[PDB]
Design a protein around this ligand. Structure first.
Ligand code: CDL
Ligand code: CDL
Ligand code: 3PE
Ligand code: 3PE
Ligand code: 3PE
Ligand code: LMT
Ligand code: LMT
Ligand code: LMT
Ligand code: LMT
Ligand code: LMT
Ligand code: LMT
Ligand code: LMT
Ligand code: LMT
Lengths: 142, 115, 120, 171, 98, 105, 345, 172
């Protein structure tokens, strides 16, 4: 569908350029993950009322969207300032900024610090995968 | 078309009698008249409370026996087959196992109602 | 992967074409190890039943050793056959498709310029 | 993606056997004996050719044979035949067993006048052989050539070269 | 055929949605299973008729036979649930969280 | 099947009513018998992977026969073009399409 | 149960999977799965307490729902192609709901939530059947259509099962719940490799079964339902301490035990297909299983928990169990890695 | 008459919507009876006969047992109907509106795809053997006795084993 194409547009242009569009794409992706997580949370751990369920859906989605926005913005600004399109380090900085955001929203320096390292490493490895042609779900070959 | 026509007339006739019965007579609604009947004294509870079923096992046995007859109702077409011996054995085996199932439930006191 | 191959009998433990292969030695190291596992099974069974580990039930111990070796021999024959079929198919496929498997003429080290990386 | 070829309306004009089902059923037993050769030719064309457009010539001979059969009834046995099919037409299933009296009168007539013997029970349901100058269709399904099977690998079995070759296992 | 099969598939989807979205009565859910069975019976029957596949008409009957066995077991289980708790409510069936 | 017991014993518990072209009661051929017979026969002996590409003609024909997507669309187009012309007063259906035919036979 | 009932019900439990594995027709495969559900319910609820009633009911409603979705796929495919088997031309959505519904039948995550609860509510010998014999029929169907399955859904189910099997088993003090999470983790490995090499799915199934069967027999010996109960083994049946420890380490996939082989070979085959990222994630989180097995080994054979005075009366009594099937499976589930080439091809 | 089968399959859809909302099983049981009758009519409409009458007969028996079980084990003081709860009523009305919308939109985008409101009635019966005799659905079902005996073996076994199963489940 066109929704898939809207996500392929992230890679249509090199990193460090069109930072506005790349921030919308990652903000949208973060929001979707927040909606999925919120759905499982309210279904399996129901709230005391409907207004608390809806309140928790908004808390998860906006927090997840905020993490995706900070990751997408920081990654592009970092590549723009450093003039290094193909550097996995730009993605590590963005993933750390996302990890710091998660800690700031949940009021936890341990989640900020632990979030920064794990999310930075995951984002840096994603860039290495994009550069080196790794497949997440390869089809059978042999 | 004809079967649809007559059944609609049957529905039409029944509904007309209901409308006549509800709009022709003189009415006089008051609370004591419309309260539920129970031999002149008031009910002590709802009629909507659980009513125990002592033949519940016979009832769910009837579900299985009703699919057994569904397997038997093609027999008028099946007796037309060239493969008469095969059909006959299948029908004999089907009836016999159903009999054995009934015999087992009978000897297990499954047809006795619970107390 | 091999199940749908030509001339595949269903549920045949040892196809007759397997009788061209050399049978395993009765003292094959894999069959000797099988018999050792059967011996361990007998000893473990004695332990679990609070019996003298080495002494009790030598008839039971002997049956454990013989069953493991007996089963292992026939299973080893089947495994030998499956590996032989795999090579028979692989090489046969290579011959039917010589364009996918060219002989690569390799160059001597007199012509190859490997980069030197000084250690220092 | 080809054009489907259809015969013209002019090619499909025939003299219709436009009599009712009781008329056909009343005459059906003698009709089956009298027009068998033409009827079996047409049915062999249809089952061999699997195409109604390839059997139009034989279909028209079926109609002409049926009209020649009924004109023989009309000229010799009109009144016994009319009394029979009218009685047969009364029944909701057009059953033979309600008009045995009228059937016998018709059967006797076509026997004396035309020599027609009614076939016995079982005779019309037989499979029969028919002779035809029409060639046998060679590819009635218009099927393509089948794809060629995979080449088979031949030779005797040898042991796996260097054993299983599974990592560090020697054998 | 096209529009009938669309509506029948939607009817199955609704019955499955009914199965997946519990209310209180276990019996109401057992009825939703019978709804899915009913939809699948008609879909199989209509397909066999539309293709003139007379050798497949045994299959819809076998669908009902095993559905009857499934429904009989479901009701048998419901008797057990009612005996324990005096209702068929599914919120009581929560002892196995610990 | 996962276990080919039926093939090993040479019996048929459920192999013989697997598709449209199978044996039918009283020899009443199912819809698309000839197309399914052609598709099954093209595919035989070459395996599923090859059959997908090399029997593509037979499968498409059989698929069209059974589901009739193209037949339904083609008739929809003719009937839609007829609706447009009749409203514009440029087409008049013949008597035999209006219920006043000369019936055959 | 009287003997006639046992024979009929156990025969039907055996029959269902045999029908599924031998059937060409997808409807007869579904019939086989129907026999399994119906026949196992009376065994699940045989002891008749509120927990067994809960377990049998939760098992019934999950399994019956999954069975309807499987039937929908079969009927939709019959509508599409006029046949009773899935083909290369079967609509991909039809195949994806088959995969979804079969994975719910197997208890793969995220359709796993029922399985630890049902296993907890039933006798150990029924948990054994639930986690071994009852896996074969749904897996057998999947193996038949392995070229048709979507690798994306499989890997996502597989990694989810390994992750939740791991974290799930980490919080358990109940043995029946630990085995259920061990089942889910191992099913995640079986499924990951199915679209690439279904023979390695069967290799993992066999090794899982011969590990799980003697583990259940060891629990059955004293009816040890909790960590604290199994921690009394040193006083009740100390001879079992060696084999339980090795079976637990084998279930965790520690070399040089037989249970290392399925994880090793599946990683090898996944990386022959460039499935490097999933294989790395799978192998890393499988270490979390070894943690809770080790904690279990700590409380049984490597330390001695406090015992009680009544246990002395147990030491006066003779036992007649385990049968010699325990020793055979226990040895072959731990000491057969040297024979690895004969198990994969 | 060209809308006849679409109307029936549309009624069937509403019946399953009513069942899905799960009022008291009394009205759920009634909903399945009406859907079963509507389902019988659809099978008849496609040229069926035996199969349509079977499924109605089986479901008439099945819901009578469910009625008996409902009055004993699934009843409350105030059984719910479709109208009793505003929330259930709203989703009943909204569900019907979404059916009209879904059929309307799908008609627009494809016009001949899943929905073909222009061609209703033209694609019900495809082929019919005009001069045939042995064609009714009962003949096909009867092949269980001759050509498809394995289908009847498994069906018979499941009913037989079902007796032993339900006796075990229900004993105390
Ligand atoms: C017959 C015509 C109705 C006459 C009823 C009447 O006497 O007047 C009562 C009523 C006058 O008001 P009322 O007497 O004060 O209402 C009190 C009733 O007891 C309250 O009425 P009730 O207790 O009988 O409950 C009404 C309820 C129960 O009514 C029914 O649903 C049964 C009929 C459904 C068919 O109906 C509904 O909830 C709305 C039905 C919507 C149609 C169902 C669509 C979903 C199901 C799809 C399957 C079709 C079956 O009208
Ligand atoms: C379009 C839909 C067409 C209709 C199709 C219907 C399909 C069959 C319906 C089966 C539903 C059912 O049986 O569930 C019973 C389930 C349990 O009912 P219960 O145990 O009797 O008591 C809880 C009820 O809330 C009743 O107790 P309560 O009165 O305390 O509920 C409080 C609350 C409940 O809040 C709701 O209204 C829930 C519905 C939210 C709107 C969803 C829009 C449709 C999407 O009501 C409100 O105050 C909010 C009203 C404004 C809502 C707009 O009830 C519900 O949760 C709502 C049922 C109706 C929702 C049908 C929509 C199905 C679509 C799938 C939704 C899930 C998607 C999640 C992944 C994304
Ligand atoms: C894409 C994003 C997926 C996000 C994964 C779901 C995480 C949602 C979550 O937070 O957990 C939900 C549930 C309980 O969470 P909750 O208690 O509300 O939060 C902590 C309160 N102190 O925790 C749980 O019980 C586990 C959640 C259910 C399992 C989630 C399955 C993930 C999807 C796998 C699909 C595979 C498809 C094949
Ligand atoms: C295997 C590899 C292991 C070896 C590698 C080790 C390298 C790690 C080095 C960097 C670690 C630095 C951590 C500093 C210490 C922080 C700490 O101890 O607190 C962790 C904190 C605890 O959470 P808490 O404060 O209790 O709040 C409730 C959260 N539910 O926060 C938490 O525990 C929750 C944090 C969750 C967010 C982290 C990201 C998790 C998701 C992974 C994304 C990957 C894609
Ligand atoms: C049949 O189900 O085998 C399945 C699987 C082989 O896979 P596959 O080829 O796809 O199956 C088709 C024909 N077998 O078969 C397997 O996965 C093999 C299962 C092996 C289980 C290993 C348990 C340890 C037992 C070791 C003793 C067995 C004998 C060892 C070798 C003896 C030779 C000395
Ligand atoms: C907060 C840190 C989080 C660490 C986790 C890893 C973060 C990195 C992922 C986000 C990167 C940008 O987002 C990523 O790029 C775009 C979004 O438009 C999409 O990119 C990809 O899409 C599809 C996958 O469906 C591929 O076939 C395509 O070739 C590629 O462009 C991905 O779906 C998304 O994952
Ligand atoms: C490039 C570096 C950029 C640095 C900024 C990004 C890092 C973000 C770190 C977020 C830290 C978490 O945020 C911090 O959480 C603590 C948790 O004690 C909370 O702190 C506040 O509330 C808590 C309890 O709620 C009290 O105990 C505490 O005394 C008070 O200060 C605040 O919410 C915030 O001060
Ligand atoms: C601590 C967590 C990390 C664990 C580390 C795991 C081991 C180390 C990872 C090394 C990364 C492998 O690096 C990757 O290897 C694969 C597989 O050969 C190759 O990558 C390529 O493989 C084949 C060609 O052979 C292509 O079809 C494929 O699309 C592409 O990914 C490259 O060599 C490199 O992109
Ligand atoms: C545990 C369940 C036990 C109950 C089931 C027992 C079933 C056993 C049935 C035994 C009776 C079979 O009876 C059998 O009938 C067939 C026809 O039907 C007879 O068959 C005879 O007539 C048929 C025509 O129908 C001829 O084609 C055949 O050559 C001739 O043998 C056999 O001579 C007789 O032996
Ligand atoms: C478990 C696998 C191995 C066994 C294989 C199965 C075959 C078993 C054969 C022995 C079975 C006989 O088992 C026997 O069954 C009958 C059923 O009629 C029961 O008997 C039943 O009917 C008789 C009638 O006189 C009465 O005892 C009573 O009404 C009822 O119990 C017996 O109490 C039981 O002893
Ligand atoms: C690759 C290398 C393979 C290493 C193999 C591992 C060997 C097994 C390790 C687990 C050890 C089993 O655990 C060990 O069991 C023995 C009995 O057998 C116990 O033995 C001791 O206690 C028991 C009672 O508890 C006494 O009856 C016994 O006489 C005494 O020696 C040990 O206290 C316990 O620690
Ligand atoms: C719960 C009950 C639900 C009721 C659902 C709605 C029932 C009414 C169905 C309306 C659907 C379309 O219904 C009717 O379809 C026929 C085909 O048979 C169309 O057919 C007619 O008009 C269209 C063009 O407008 C052409 O096909 C042609 O001129 C003529 O055949 C009708 O124009 C349309 O009105
Ligand atoms: C472990 C439990 C299972 C054992 C119990 C069941 C025993 C088997 C009894 C059912 C026997 C079915 O037996 C099977 O019947 C069918 C017809 O139905 C025969 O089928 C034969 O006639 C049909 C008629 O259409 C042909 O199309 C088919 O090609 C031909 O094989 C099989 O050749 C025979 O093998």
């Amino acid at each position: 569908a066109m929704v898939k194409r809207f996500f392929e547009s992230y890679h249509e242009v090199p990193d460090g350029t069109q930072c506005h569009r790349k921030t919308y794409i990652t903000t949208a992706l973060g929001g979707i993950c927040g909606i999925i997580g919120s759905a499982y949370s309210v279904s399996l751990n129901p709230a005391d009322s409907t207004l608390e369920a809806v309140a928790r859906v908004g808390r998860y989605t906006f927090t997840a969207a905020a993490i995706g926005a900070m990751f997408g913005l920081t990654t592009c600004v970092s590549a723009q300032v450093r003039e290094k399109p193909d550097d996995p380090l730009n993605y590590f900085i963005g993933g750390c900024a996302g990890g710091l955001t998660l800690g700031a929203r949940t009021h936890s320096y341990g989640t900020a610090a632990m979030g920064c390292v794990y999310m930075g490493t995951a984002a840096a490895l994603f860039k290495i995968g994009k550069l080196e042609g790794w497949e997440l779900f390869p089809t059978p070959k042999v | 078309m004809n079967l649809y026509t007559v059944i609609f007339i049957n529905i039409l006739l029944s509904l007309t009698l209901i409308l006549v019965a509800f709009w022709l007579p003189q009415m006089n609604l008051y609370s004591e008249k419309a309260n539920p009947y129970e031999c002149g004294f008031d009910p002590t509870s709802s009629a909507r409370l659980p009513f125990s079923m002592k033949f519940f096992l016979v009832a769910i046995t009837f579900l299985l026996f009703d699919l057994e007859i569904a397997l038997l109702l093609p027999l008028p077409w099946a007796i037309q087959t060239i493969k008469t011996s095969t059909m006959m054995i299948m029908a004999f085996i089907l009836v016999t196992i159903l009999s054995l199932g009934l015999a087992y439930e009978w000897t297990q006191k499954g047809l006795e109602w619970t107390e | 992967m091999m199940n749908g191959r030509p001339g595949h009998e269903p549920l045949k433990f040892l196809p007759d074409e397997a009788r061209s292969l050399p049978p395993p030695k009765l003292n094959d190291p894999r069959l000797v190890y099988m018999g050792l596992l059967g011996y361990c099974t007998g000893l473990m069974d004695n332990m679990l039943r609070m019996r003298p580990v080495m002494r009790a039930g030598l008839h039971r111990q002997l049956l454990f050793v013989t069953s493991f070796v007996f089963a292992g021999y026939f299973y080893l024959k089947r495994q030998n056959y499956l590996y032989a079929v795999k090579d028979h198919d692989m090489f046969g496929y290579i011959k039917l498709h010589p364009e996918d498997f060219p002989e690569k003429e390799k160059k001597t080290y007199a012509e190859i310029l490997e980069p030197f990386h000084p250690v220092r | 993606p080809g054009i489907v070829e259809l015969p013209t309306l002019e090619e499909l004009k025939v003299e219709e056997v436009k009599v009712s089902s009781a008329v056909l059923k009343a005459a059906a037993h003698h009709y089956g004996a009298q027009c068998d050769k033409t009827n079996k030719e047409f049915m062999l064309c249809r089952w061999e050719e699997k195409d109604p457009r390839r059997c139009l010539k034989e279909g028209k001979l079926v109609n002409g044979c049926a009209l020649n059969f009924f004109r023989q009834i009309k000229s010799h046995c009109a009144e016994p035949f009319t009394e029979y099919w009218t009685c047969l037409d009364y029944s909701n299933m057009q059953l033979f067993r309600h008009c045995r009296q009228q059937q016998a009168k018709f059967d006797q007539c076509v026997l004396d006048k035309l020599g027609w013997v009614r076939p016995d029970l079982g005779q019309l349901s037989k499979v029969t052989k028919v002779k035809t100058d029409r060639p046998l269709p060679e590819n009635p399904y218009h099927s393509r050539a089948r794809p060629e099977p995979n080449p088979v690998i031949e030779g005797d079995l040898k042991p796996a070269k260097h054993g299983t070759r599974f990592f560090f296992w020697t054998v | 055929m096209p529009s009938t099969f669309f509506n029948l598939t939607m009817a199955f989807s609704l019955s499955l949605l009914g199965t997946l979205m519990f209310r209180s009565h276990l019996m109401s859910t057992l009825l939703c299973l019978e709804g899915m069975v009913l939809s699948l019976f008609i879909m199989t029957s209509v397909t066999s008729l539309n293709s003139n596949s007379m050798s497949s008409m045994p299959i819809p009957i076998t669908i009902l036979v095993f559905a009857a066995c499934e429904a009989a077991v479901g009701l048998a289980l419901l008797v057990k649930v009612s005996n324990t708790y005096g209702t068929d409510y599914v919120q009581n069936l929560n002892l196995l969280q610990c | 099947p996962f276990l080919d017991i039926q093939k090993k014993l040479g019996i048929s518990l459920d192999r013989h009513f697997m598709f449209l072209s199978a044996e039918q009661p009283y020899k009443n051929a199912a819809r698309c018998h000839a197309f399914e017979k052609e598709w099954i026969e093209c595919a035989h002996g070459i395996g599923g992977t090859r059959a997908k590409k090399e029997c593509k003609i037979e499968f498409d024909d059989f698929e069209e026969c059974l589901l009739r997507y193209k037949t339904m669309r083609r008739m929809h187009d003719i009937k839609k073009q007829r609706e447009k012309l009749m409203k514009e007063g440029k087409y008049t259906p013949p008597p035999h399409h209006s219920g006043r035919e000369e019936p055959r036979p | 149960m009287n003997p006639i009932t046992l024979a009929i019900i156990y025969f039907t439990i055996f029959l269902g999977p045999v029908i599924t594995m031998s059937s060409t027709n997808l409807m007869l495969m579904w019939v086989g799965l129907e026999f399994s559900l119906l026949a196992i319910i009376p065994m699940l609820i045989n002891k008749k307490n509120p927990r067994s009633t809960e377990a049998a009911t939760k098992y019934f409603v999950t399994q019956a729902t999954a069975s309807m979705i499987i039937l929908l796929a079969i009927v939709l495919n019959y509508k599409q192609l006029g046949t009773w088997m899935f083909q290369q031309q079967t609509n991909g959505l039809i195949l994806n709901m088959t995969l979804m519904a079969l994975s719910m039948k197997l208890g793969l995550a995220p359709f796993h939530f029922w399985l630890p609860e049902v296993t907890q509510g039933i006798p150990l010998h029924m948990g054994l059947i639930l986690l071994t014999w009852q896996k074969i029929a749904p897996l057998s169907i999947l193996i038949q259509i392995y070229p048709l399955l979507n690798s994306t859904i499989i890997l996502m189910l597989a990694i989810t099962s390994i992750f939740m099997g791991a974290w799930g088993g980490l919080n358990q003090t109940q043995m029946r719940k630990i085995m259920a999470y061990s089942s889910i983790a191992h099913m995640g490995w079986m499924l990951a490799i199915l679209p690439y090499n279904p023979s390695l799915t069967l290799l993992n199934l066999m090794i899982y079964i011969i590990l799980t069967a003697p583990m259940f027999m060891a629990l059955m010996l004293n009816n040890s339902m909790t960590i604290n109960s199994i921690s009394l083994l040193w006083n009740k049946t100390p001879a079992m301490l060696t084999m339980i420890s090795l079976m637990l380490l084998s279930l965790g996939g520690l070399p040089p035990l037989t249970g290392f082989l399925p994880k090793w070979i599946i990683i090898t085959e996944l990386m022959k297909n460039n499935c490097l990222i999933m294989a790395t994630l799978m192998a890393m989180m499988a270490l979390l299983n070894l943690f809770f097995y080790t904690r279990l080994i700590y409380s049984t054979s490597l330390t001695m928990f406090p015992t009680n005075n009544n246990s002395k009366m147990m030491t006066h009594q003779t036992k007649t169990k385990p049968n010699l099937m325990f020793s055979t499976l226990a040895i072959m589930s731990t000491m057969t890695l040297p024979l690895a080439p004969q198990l994969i091809t | 008459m060209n809308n006849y089968i679409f109307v029936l399959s549309s009624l069937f859809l509403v019946g399953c919507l009513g069942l899905a909302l799960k009022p008291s099983p009394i009205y759920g049981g009634l909903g399945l009876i009406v859907s079963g009758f509507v389902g019988c009519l659809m099978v008849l409409g496609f040229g069926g006969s035996f199969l349509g009458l079977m499924v109605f007969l089986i479901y008439l028996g099945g819901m009578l047992v469910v009625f008996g079980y409902t009055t004993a084990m699934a009843t409350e003081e105030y059984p719910e109907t479709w109208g009793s709860n505003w929330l259930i009523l709203g989703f009943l009305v909204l569900g019907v509106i979404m059916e009209v919308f879904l059929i309307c939109v799908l008609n627009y985008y494809d016009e001949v795809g899943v929905i073909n409101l222009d061609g209703l009635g033209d694609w019900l019966m495809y082929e019919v053997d005009d001069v045939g005799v042995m064609l009714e659905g009962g003949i096909g079902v009867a092949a269980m006795y001759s050509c498809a005996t394995w289908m009847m073996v498994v069906a018979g076994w499941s009913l037989f084993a079902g007796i032993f199963i339900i006796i075990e489940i229900t004993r105390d």
